Each structure stands twice: as C-alpha cells, then as structure tokens.
Design a binder for these strands. Sequence first.
RNA 1: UUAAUAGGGACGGUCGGGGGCAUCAGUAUUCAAUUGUCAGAGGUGAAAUUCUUGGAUUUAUUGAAGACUAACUACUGCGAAAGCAUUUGCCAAGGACGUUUUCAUUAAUCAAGAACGAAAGUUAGGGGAUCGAAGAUGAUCAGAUACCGUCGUAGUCUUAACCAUAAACUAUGCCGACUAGGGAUCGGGUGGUGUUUUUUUAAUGACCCACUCGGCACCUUACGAGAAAUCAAAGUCUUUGGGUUCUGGGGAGUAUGGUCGCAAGGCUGAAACUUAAAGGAAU
Lengths: 129, 141, 41, 48, 163
Amino acid sequence: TRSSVLADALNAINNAEKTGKRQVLIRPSSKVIIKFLQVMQKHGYIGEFEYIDDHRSGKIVVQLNGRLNKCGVISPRFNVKIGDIEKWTANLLPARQFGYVILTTSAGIMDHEEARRKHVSGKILGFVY
Amino acid sequence: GRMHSAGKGISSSAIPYSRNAPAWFKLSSESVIEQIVKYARKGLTPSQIGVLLRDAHGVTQARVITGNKIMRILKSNGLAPEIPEDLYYLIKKAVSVRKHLERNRKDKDAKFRLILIESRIHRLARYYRTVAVLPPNWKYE
Amino acid sequence: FELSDVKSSKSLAEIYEDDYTLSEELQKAHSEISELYANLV
Amino acid sequence: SGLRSFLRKKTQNVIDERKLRVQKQLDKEKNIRKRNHQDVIEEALSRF
Amino acid sequence: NSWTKIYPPLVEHLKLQVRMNLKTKSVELRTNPKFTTDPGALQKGADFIKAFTLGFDLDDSIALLRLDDLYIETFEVKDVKTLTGDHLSRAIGRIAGKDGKTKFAIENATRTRIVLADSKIHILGGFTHIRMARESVVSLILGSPPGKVYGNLRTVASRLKER
RNA sequence: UUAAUAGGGACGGUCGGGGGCAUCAGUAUUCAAUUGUCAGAGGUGAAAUUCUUGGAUUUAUUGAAGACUAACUACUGCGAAAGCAUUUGCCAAGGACGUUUUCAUUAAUCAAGAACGAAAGUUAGGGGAUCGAAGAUGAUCAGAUACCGUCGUAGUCUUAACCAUAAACUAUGCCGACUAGGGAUCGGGUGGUGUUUUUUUAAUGACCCACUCGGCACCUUACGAGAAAUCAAAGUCUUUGGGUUCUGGGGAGUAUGGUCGCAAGGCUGAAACUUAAAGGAAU
C-alpha cells in the first residue's frame, strides 16, 4: 500500500538518474512533492519539471540532467530544533557544506541554510546531495 | 488488488476529464430527474437506473448532467434504500449459497465462499455502522 | 573387453554377413613392431 | 541441463517449424498475386 | 526420399508388384502370379515395410528381407511400470542416455536394433537376441542406473562371442 | 472537495478437465448361461504348487457386478491449496474482459480461533470387480533375466464422524512503486483484411495481421546483486529509512611410556591322568 507519495517520487527520480533516462514520470503529485521539487530546482539539482493535472491527484514529468547524486526522504518526519539541524547535516550529507537537508518549518519547506537564516525550525522531510 | 482472490484485473470505467455536460446533450435537467423517479418507483436500483439513462437517454453521468448524484436526487424526493446497495446484494449471495448449502451439504467449497462472503459482510457492515448509515444494533442475520 | 557405445556402422545383415564369413589385426601389430625393431636394430 | 535441455531443444524446434510455415504462407500469397496479375449447363451449375 | 532404395529389392529379388496409394497414404503390395516364385515373399515384403514404418533405418529393415528368422518386439513403458509426468520423461532419457549412447550400448551388445518412439519401444533382431535386449531396457525403465546396466551388457556380450 | 493505474458493489457476452446432485456412454477385468472342438492350460531365467476328458485354454451370441475415463493429452486450462479429464440437465460460486453505471477510503500487515487439507490409518453400516500390507503355500537350481508363482486378510469404493501428516518445493514472508529486450500460447476486447462461411426462419462462427489488458510460461541479456551456482528478483547509484509479522546470535591428518577396553601363541579330544576312538595337518 501507499504510505509516502513523496518517498515513491524520490525513489523514481533516483532510479531514473540511475539508468540515465533524461525524463522521469511521478504519480501521484502533491504540494509537499512539488515544493520539494522547487527547492531542488533552486539549488539546481533538477532541470525543467512539469505538472500534469487530471482532476485527480495528478502527475509530474521531470527533466533530468544527471547531477542528482542522491535524494531521499527521512521517515517518519522527526521534529527538529534549531540546534539539532547541524547534527542532521552531519548524519545525512557526505560533507558539511555538501548537499542540502530539507525542513518544513512554520514558514514552509526550505533548506537548512535558509531555515538558519530565518531562525525557523520544524520537522524534517529528507535530504539531497 | 482483489481481496479473498489473487486476481489483479484493472478493468473499470474511465471518467472523462471534462466535468461539464456534453454539448450534443440537449435535454432538460428536470426531465432527467422525473425519469429517475419513474425507474426507482418501478423498483430499479441506482446502479441499474444509471445504466438505462446512460444507455438510452444520453445521460453520461447523472452528476454532470444535473449537478447532483442519483441517490441524493432519490433522497430529495423521498426514495431511499433500506441498506446500502453494495451491502444489500452481498446478503442475497449469502442467502442463495446458504439455501444451496441446505440441499447440498457436501459442497465444501460453497461452505468456504460462505465464509469469505460473510466476512466481507462483516467488514462492510462494520464500516456503515461507523458512518451511522446503518443503525448500531444492526447485525447480520 | 570394451563394448562400443555408439551407433554401429554395420547393418544387421552386414554383421550377420560377417559371421557367415588368433587375430589378423594382432598379427599386423606384430609386423610393424618387427619393422620398427629392424629399423632400430 | 538434463530435463531442462530436452525441453529447451524442443521449444526451439517448434519455433523452427513456425518460421518455415510463415515463410510459405508468404510464398503462396506471392504466387496468388502472380496468378491474379496474369457446355452451357456447366456454366449453369458453376455456382455449385 | 528413401523410396529409391525401397522398391528395387521388392521388385527385383522378391519379384513383387509395388505401389503406394497417395489417396490412402499406404504402401501397396501384390504378388504377380506369372513372375513371383517364393510364396513367402509377399509376407516378407510386408514385414519389411512395417519395420520402416515403425521407424527403423532402411538398411536395418533390409535385414528382414535378407534373413528369415528376424522378428520385431514391441511394448510400452506403461506395461513395465506406472510412470507419468517427469518420471516418464526421465525413463525415456535413461533408455537413450546422453547422446543416445545407452541405446547403442544395448544395441551393440545384444545384437539388435531399438527404436524409441516416445514411450513406445520396438526391438528388431533374433528371437533370443530381442529378449536379451528386452531385459536391459526394462531394467532401465524401473530405475536402474545406466552405467550399472553398461556393466551387465559387457557380460552378456562376452558370452555372445564365445558362443 | 476528487472519484486513486486503492478498494467495494453492480450490469453485458463470454471462459474454465472449479464444485455438488442426478443422468448417458465406453471398452476393459471377473463371473454366469448357451455355443464348436479337443489335451493340455497357466507361470518364470530354469521350475513346482494350481485348473483341466463333469471339457480346461481358446472360439462365438449374450447377461450381471464393481471400479475407471486410454489414444486426443499439450513446459495448455480451472481452482487459495490439496486437487480437477465421457454425454446431458439442475443447483449455486468465480477469474479475466467491457462499461461516459454505483459507494467514497470502506485499506496493508498480523494473535488466538476457524474451514479444508494428497496417500496411509481409526470407529459404525453398505459394497467387495480388480489390485493388494499381513498370513498360508509351490520352488529353493542358476547372478543380466536373483526373487518369482498360487490362494489372498485389512485396505483399494461409498455413507456419518475422527486422524491433519507429504520432496504438501521458487528446497525462497506479505503489501506497494520503479529498474531490459523478443516472440509463442490461453481468455476478453478494438481495428483492418480476404479465405472458409452463407440465401427473410432465428441464431451466431473459423483463419490472417496489428493493438490493448489479465494468465501459465519461455529465449537472449543484466550499466544492478552475489564468492559462485545463479537472480527481472535473491536488484534500488560506496555505509544502509516505502509499510509490516515471524525467527537466529575449522576441515583434513599424524604421533602417543596416560585412562579405559579389545587382543598373541603353542594340533583338538587331553586333565589332578604324557590317556582311546574319531577328526586336523602332512601325505
């Protein structure tokens, strides 16, 4: 059964970049997914990506340039304080400034650098590096 | 995806994307509602009613043409079912096999499908009791 | 003795023919061996 | 190996007969196109 | 394709009238009163054609015509043992052996021919010889390892030569 | 608020060696009646019990009984599994497909408990053709034919309950997603096409090609995994998070002032007895 649509999406992205497809399809779509993709695009990891609506959950088609080393979802979505963020960046990333860790805070879903800049915190969604 | 069976068949209806009435459809919504009344008064079930209207009257969906689902149209004008249509038909299939098991006591397989079907009734009956569609005291036979 | 484990070239009439008509091959082997010794001698 | 090879040998055989036979169905159809390209009572009973 | 070598011995040595019926898919044989001389030729020709029909090689079939004491022994694996499915298939494989070797080992030792038509076995040779072959094959059907049968085949062959 | 390539229910025509209750056929086995004939028949490697001049065996015209569905029979079908092969009818169940019909999350996993569960076995009736543990009996000669032959109890069939075990196998938890190609087959549906078909009774097929689902599988390969055999899963980009139950934390030899055992010999008889016959050895 389906537990995390986001988990399925990231797994599909990882497999597509695995085998070298330039484009990959994701379904179902969601706001958590789509905001995660906007963050990835701002950090530049992913190229053009494109939302299907079908009057249902919807789909996405995502353009790949092959620079995604790894993207994953940490489950369940642990609560994270401002102090703890560094610990997380230590565990999930190859090096301290290498990759990003994605947090949902009261201000929305953003990377940990932006969360630190805004002095916000919340629970964790996953990692990209 | 079948429970109590290993089949994974996916055959099913595919609702069109557009949620507006077809352009070629040129019948008044009220006339549709009256037709729904006649069939239900005759004794046809909402599933059967939708078949006839779709087959012979061009009513793709009751909701798209009229803006309302069939039952609420039936409930609005005083026609409502004793028990939910899915639950209803489940019982007779249990009745018929039980009537069968009376005459044929060696039908071990029919005894099984009785176990499968009653369990399906128990799960479905539990659900409607939770939603309050079915009175709490209700029990299967 | 070793028994041939492959299909026989000869047909049953042929082997039956062979039966109708100590070992010549054994005396042949003597002949070369004598020839080899005469050359070696 | 063993039994599996024997089953394998036969399936590839069956695939072979199919190849020979499909090619021949093409052959008549190539023969038919060439043919198409190039007593009163007997007429009275020709339909039968 | 073999018929060019089938009708000559029938028509010349046995002086028989040959034909095959395309309509009934049968080989057609008759005795010519003015030319045929041997009363037993006609049955001899019929027996020879049957050997080819059963599946035996033509040259082996000629032995039926050349010699007068050759018979074809036929039986089914079901007659020996109640084998079905993969057990039946393995029994057939055991008789033939790798590359059909085991069949040849019986063949050369017991001085016969064996045709393994699926579960149907036909053995051609002298009455004693076919029985000698028949014992080897039945043992293989029942589960006897072939290399063990190969040992016994050597023994009987040793007796064949000394007699 | 959607109607999830979640799920439920429905309806249309199909599809199945799925199930039960009856019903029809089929040879074959045994037995019985009649029918013609006469010395053997049977059996095994070689034989003997055994049957037989009240007629065996065999021939032919029938009848009765109980099982069972050959060939067609397939890396084909159905069923959760165990399993399921004659015709016809009744009874209910069902996979898949089609659907611009219906519910709206009703779902995944999982204790106890429950249903069934090959063959064998137990209790109490019926039946008992065939085969047949056990038991009896013929023969005990010869090693490829070396364990066969005759009688044959329980059982093999069925009714009502117990027994719940199989190499009951992918020797391999479940649910969900994604990660290669190819053509063969089964069921359904879509389009095309010209052969077989055929005509206002009605009713509807078969073949060819392509497309689409679902099923048993199969060939070649893994940019992945494994030491390997191999694996489209036993795979998910260096070290690890989709959900969830159960279980687990040296090989091969040599030597022996030890321990524990086993063991040598000188003819037997025959020793407290230089002691017989008869054997052994030698001849």
